[PDB]
């Protein structure tokens, strides 16, 4: 009862990444010559999971009249406003506005923040260990949509900054299933998860070799490493991309509004 | 990047509708007493966007000798043949002809089709929600040109099949800016988008009312509802029609060759 605590994130993994991506679509579509949007989508997703539990983008709200894409779009407007004179608010601000739809009562909000901090995304399956000694990966290109060369583009991974060719250890246990070139490897846990790593020297690795979490793979080749992460969907015997950032202990985003 | 994915639709919205409309002009011009053409223009547009990115009808192709109107006209002939013995083909079939300018290697064809399924037109701005509970609007009169009375006509909207006397909810957030008659309303998101709805009784509705996505507007009068949708061009301070079908989650076209 009061001894029972729901996790900070309860959505299924595919829906969690889909909801992230939907919000990056709204950021990217409003990004133009005069405005660059990189909302704090983590704060959005923690709020949405607290309010709406294990929602899917096409489920209906409590009125029965709108789906969660619409709810997310309305939230985007509450945070960022509209052309020409956009606004910039935080989720915390909306959650403390007593007239707002997003309001959370003072005492409940203390508990909500504690659980968000204590549990985070660490209840997801198939978490990834840091590949270097650090307290947070610095993410200079987040997952999802953005504008690049004035054009909408979907980035199905994350770019991370790794200084000084640090020795790079595997984030996951699995088998090396592909070594396409000298700087790309694919590690797969059969029918579970698949991690693609770009930017690490692969000279001491061949297809079929088993690696464990922490196995040294090689030194980082330049300053950026790219991760892509996929989960397996038994129902259709295929794979879907997930946002890798959710699966490491902590990241720091360098792109912000 | 291998981690970078372009959308299924890359064209600007005005160019996308203009390309649709051009193809409907070709279908309508060749429709006669013995042949009625309603090509699968969605398949055309997804192929063209994959092959030629954010093209405009009057742009020249890479050879510099033909514009995209000419390319679309040549494709119509490849898909449909010529008088007096028309022969219907599919876009996917044309992509396997190694002697044709439409060839796409098998893997890339499968991949762009998968992206078409995942993304569709959902990367366009200012999407519309279904006005009733459904997985697809049945469109029995599509946007663009057709023949009526052996006369060419341009239809700047779509007609959708909805059961008569059924509750109808708003596809869009905005203000009711016009209530012309007891069966017509116009909703405007100011200087963004304008939605005309014909066939919903508007007696509970007044000019100046705010609506959200999902707001009950009224019950349907007849067995179809007509939508028109316009976007705003700040450069000229005017509006232009777009094909409304692109903006809903899914449609089913009843008019086929």
């Amino acid at each position: 009862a009061s001894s029972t605590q729901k996790p900070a994130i309860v959505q299924e993994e595919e829906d969690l990444t889909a909801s992230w991506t939907y919000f990056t679509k709204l950021d990217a579509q409003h990004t133009d010559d005069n405005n660059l949007f990189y909302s704090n989508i983590d704060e959005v997703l923690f709020y949405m999971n607290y309010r709406y539990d294990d929602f899917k983008l096409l489920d209906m709200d409590s009125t029965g009249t709108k789906n969660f894409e619409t709810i997310l779009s309305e939230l985007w407007t509450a945070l960022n406003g509209k052309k020409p004179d956009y606004q910039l608010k935080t989720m915390q601000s909306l959650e403390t506005d007593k007239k707002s739809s997003y309001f959370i009562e003072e005492e409940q909000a203390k508990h909500y923040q504690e659980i968000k901090k204590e549990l985070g995304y660490q209840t997801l399956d198939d978490l990834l260990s840091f590949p270097v000694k650090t307290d947070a990966l610095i993410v200079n290109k987040r997952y999802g949509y953005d504008k690049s060369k004035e054009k909408l583009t979907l980035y199905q991974g994350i770019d991370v900054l790794i200084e000084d060719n640090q020795p790079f250890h595997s984030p996951m246990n699995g088998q090396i299933v592909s070594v396409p070139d000298t700087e790309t490897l694919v590690i797969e846990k059969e029918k579970v998860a698949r991690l693609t790593i770009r930017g690490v020297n692969t000279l001491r690795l061949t297809k079929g070799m088993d690696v464990e979490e922490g196995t040294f793979l090689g030194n980082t080749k330049n300053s950026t490493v790219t991760f892509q992460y996929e989960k397996y969907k038994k129902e259709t015997k295929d794979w879907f991309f997930v946002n890798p950032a959710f699966y490491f202990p902590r990241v720091t985003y360098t792109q912000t509004t």
Side-chain angles (χ1 to χ4, degrees), chain A residues 137-163:
Chain A
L137 284 166
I138 299 170
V139 175
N140 45 7
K141 184 171 188 81
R142 69 184 188 171
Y143 185 96
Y145 288 101
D146 199 357
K147 291 291 228 298
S148 49
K149 302 166 253 263
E150 305 305 354
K151 276 324 298 212
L152 187 70
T153 305
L154 175 63
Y155 198 66
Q156 293 176 130
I158 58 171
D159 289 356
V160 307
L161 180 83
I162 306 283
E163 307 224 281

Side-chain angles (χ1 to χ4, degrees), chain A residues 79-97:
Chain A
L79 290 163
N80 293 293
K82 58 170 167 52
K83 252 176 154 263
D85 300 313
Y86 284 100
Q87 299 159 221
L88 189 51
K89 306 178 171 182
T90 66
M91 209 60 228
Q92 186 263 338
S93 279
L94 297 179
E95 289 160 7
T96 59
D97 182 337

Side-chain angles (χ1 to χ4, degrees), chain A residues 23-31 37-39 41 76 142:
Chain A
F23 224 82
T24 66
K25 190 185 64 164
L26 302 175
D27 276 350
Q29 280 172 343
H30 292 88
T31 287
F37 296 91
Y38 293 113
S39 295
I41 303 169
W76 191 96
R142 69 184 188 171

Side-chain angles (χ1 to χ4, degrees), chain A residues 219-236:
Chain A
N219 276 3
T220 309
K221 205 243 299 185
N222 41 77
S223 307
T224 299
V225 165
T226 298
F227 292 113
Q228 294 191 273
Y229 199 37
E230 296 166 274
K231 297 307 193 84
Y232 181 69
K233 170 102 75 151
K234 274 253 148 43
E235 284 92 337
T236 60

Side-chain angles (χ1 to χ4, degrees), chain A residues 2 20 26 30 48 53 59 77 80 113 149 151 161-162 165 169 171 182 194 213 225 239-240:
Chain A
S2 279
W20 170 283
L26 302 175
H30 292 88
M48 290 285 300
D53 303 293
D59 296 341
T77 298
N80 293 293
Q113 296 290 339
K149 302 166 253 263
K151 276 324 298 212
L161 180 83
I162 306 283
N165 309 117
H169 299 260
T182 71
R194 191 161 64 197
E213 278 173 70
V225 165
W239 297 82
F240 60 90

Side-chain angles (χ1 to χ4, degrees), chain A residues 48-212:
Chain A
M48 290 285 300
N49 276 253
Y50 172 84
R51 193 76 55 163
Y52 297 117
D53 303 293
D54 64 319
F55 72 95
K56 312 196 188 231
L57 286 173
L58 299 177
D59 296 341
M60 296 306 277
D61 78 322
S62 79
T63 66
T65 67
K66 45 187 59 156
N67 68 16
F68 284 105
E69 298 182 308
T70 296
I71 296 288
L72 286 173
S73 187
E74 287 176 345
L75 180 53
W76 191 96
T77 298
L79 290 163
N80 293 293
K82 58 170 167 52
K83 252 176 154 263
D85 300 313
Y86 284 100
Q87 299 159 221
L88 189 51
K89 306 178 171 182
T90 66
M91 209 60 228
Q92 186 263 338
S93 279
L94 297 179
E95 289 160 7
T96 59
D97 182 337
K98 287 201 79 91
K99 54 150 217 203
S100 168
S101 325
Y102 308 104
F103 182 68
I104 307 172
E105 178 272 332
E106 189 143 352
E107 277 328 293
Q108 282 138 261
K110 324 198 146 313
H111 181 83
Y112 158 74
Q113 296 290 339
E114 151 66 19
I115 293 298
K116 163 162 72 78
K117 184 180 46 134
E118 178 202 349
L119 306 193
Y121 294 107
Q122 291 285 113
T123 55
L124 296 180
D125 292 337
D126 316 306
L127 299 177
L128 298 173
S129 292
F130 285 132
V132 297
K133 308 278 207 342
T134 184
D135 267 358
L137 284 166
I138 299 170
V139 175
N140 45 7
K141 184 171 188 81
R142 69 184 188 171
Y143 185 96
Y145 288 101
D146 199 357
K147 291 291 228 298
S148 49
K149 302 166 253 263
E150 305 305 354
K151 276 324 298 212
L152 187 70
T153 305
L154 175 63
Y155 198 66
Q156 293 176 130
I158 58 171
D159 289 356
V160 307
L161 180 83
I162 306 283
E163 307 224 281
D164 71 271
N165 309 117
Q166 282 161 261
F168 188 106
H169 299 260
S170 184
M172 86 174 245
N173 177 288
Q175 185 170 98
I176 299 182
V177 293
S178 175
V179 200
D181 62 37
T182 71
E183 68 194 8
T184 301
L185 52 99
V186 184
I187 299 165
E188 182 176 306
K189 184 167 325 213
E190 177 163 56
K191 316 199 235 153
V192 176
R194 191 161 64 197
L195 182 67
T196 303
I197 303 171
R198 300 161 194 293
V200 180
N201 285 300
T202 70
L203 178 143
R204 300 246 266 152
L205 302 157
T206 190
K207 148 166 37 73
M209 288 182 7
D210 279 0
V211 296
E212 308 176 3

